[PDB]
Amino acid sequence: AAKSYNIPELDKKLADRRYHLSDTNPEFTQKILKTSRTIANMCYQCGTCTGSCPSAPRSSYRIRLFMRRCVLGLENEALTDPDLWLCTTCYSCTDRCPRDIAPTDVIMAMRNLAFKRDIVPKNFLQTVQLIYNSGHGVPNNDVNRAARTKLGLPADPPTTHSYPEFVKGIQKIIDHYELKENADRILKG
Amino acid sequence: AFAVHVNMERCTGCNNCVVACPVNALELNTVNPSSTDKIYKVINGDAVILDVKHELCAGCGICVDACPYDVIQLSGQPP
C-alpha cells in the first residue's frame, strides 16, 4: 500500500485497504437516492437487513455492507462487487428496517448503474433479447402449443404471441431507452 | 336469532325449506297468527333468506333436516 508498483499481482496483493476521503462519490450517492426513491443516507447499521436476508447465510453477500457503501459513496466498490446479483428481492430487509429504508430498492438502483457501466450477467441480456423478439420473457414452444391444444385452449395465448402488432410498440419502448442496442453490444465479445 | 346460510350453487328450488320452517308456518297454520314474517322464499329457483338481520330464526334444524341434498348450514355461534 506504499504506492503503485505496476506489477499486477503485487498491486492486487498490496492494494490499499484504507478508506480515504478521495474515495467518496457524492454524485453516486445522489444518483442512488434519486433512482431508489428511498432514504438510504439514514441507515445506522443495525444489521436487521443482513439478519433477515436469505442470501447472506450461504455467500459473502451483505446488504448492510452495500448500504454502508452507498452512504460513503464507494462507487467502484459497490458496482463491481459480484455479490450485487445475489439479491432475490424478497423484500424482507425492507419489511423489517427500523429506519424505513428500502435496501432492496438501493440494490435495484445499484444494478441499474452497474448495467450503465456494462457490468451485468448474461441471463439479463438474453431476457432482453427474448422480450424484444416476442414480448415474452418465457416464450411458447411447439410442445407447449401441442399441450395447450390437447387441453382445449388455443394453440397460442391471447398475448403478443397471437397479436404480433403490439410487438412493434414494445420494441419502440425498448429502443427509446436503447436497451437492445446496449444488450447486443455487451453480448458481442 | 341465529344465522342460516344457503349454498346457492347446489340449491334446486325444491321449496322444502320454505314449507318446513316453523316460523314460515306461523302465518297460515296458527290460531291468531302472532308474527307474519318469513325466513325463506324461493326467488329465481334458489332459496333466499329474507331474515337479513338474523332476528327470527330459532336454530330448530327443521330446515337443515329438510333440504334433501344438504345445502343449508346452520351457525349456532354469534355472527
Binding site: - | 336454530g59 330448530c60 334444524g61 337443515v64 333436516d65 346452520l74 349456532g76 355461534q77 354469534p78
Partner: protein, 77 residues
C-alpha cells in the same frame, strides 16, 4: 402488553373446555356437550352474566357442529 392471563376456549372432541392459564395455576370450566339439555338454568344463575344460550334445537338434534348449546365468555367468567 401482558400475556400470561391466557384465555382459551377449545372444543376437545365433545367437551368444550374453557380455560384461564397462569404460570402454575389454571382454571377449567368444562362443559360436556353430550349431557347439556339446552335449559338456561346456567344462564339465569351466572352471577357474572357470561353464559349465553345458543342453537338449542339444532345442537340437541346434531345438525350444528361449530357450536355448543351454551356459549361462555371465559374472559368474563
Amino acid at each position: 402488553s401482558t400475556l400470561f392471563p391466557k384465555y382459551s376456549k377449545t372444543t376437545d372432541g365433545s367437551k368444550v373446555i374453557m380455560e384461564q392459564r397462569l404460570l402454575q395455576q389454571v382454571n377449567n370450566l368444562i362443559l360436556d356437550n353430550d349431557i347439556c339439555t339446552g335449559c338456561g338454568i346456567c344462564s339465569e344463575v351466572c352471577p357474572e352474566e357470561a353464559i349465553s344460550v345458543g342453537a338449542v334445537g339444532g345442537v340437541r338434534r346434531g345438525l350444528v357442529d361449530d357450536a355448543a348449546s351454551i356459549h361462555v365468555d371465559e374472559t368474563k367468567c
